[PDB]
């Protein structure tokens, strides 16, 4: 219902969206464009990394999980710098920067 109506943005529907990708997909189907019970890409993209930074998404020591969160929200610079710090994934982060360049 609230995937069709883009409502109840605060309720993460955790009963059915238990994975991270299920959350991203749940919200990107809820973002809106031009006051209550409404979320926009700017709020969502900022809300995610500002409040729930790397710390929240890298506790499982899985780096790509956070990268996908930033890249699939149009925050390409964040995801590039972030992934560029993983000494094992420097190569990959430089190139995804070149492509964007």
């Amino acid at each position: 219902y609230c995937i069709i109506g883009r409502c109840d943005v605060t309720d993460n529907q955790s009963e059915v969206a238990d994975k991270t990708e299920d959350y991203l997909w749940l919200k990107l189907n809820q973002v809106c464009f031009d006051p209550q019970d409404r979320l926009t890409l700017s709020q969502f993209q900022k809300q995610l990394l500002e409040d729930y930074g790397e710390s929240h998404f890298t506790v499982n020591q899985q780096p790509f999980l956070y990268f996908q969160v930033l890249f699939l929200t149009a925050q390409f610079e964040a995801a590039v710098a972030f992934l560029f710090r993983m000494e094992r994934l420097r190569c990959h982060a430089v190139h995804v920067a070149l492509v964007l360049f």
């Binding site: 994975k19 991270t20 959350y23 929240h56 506790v59």
Partner: peptide
């Protein structure tokens, strides 16, 4: 309260 469990 988003989960941190990656789709595996």
């Amino acid at each position: 309260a988003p989960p941190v469990r990656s789709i595996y």
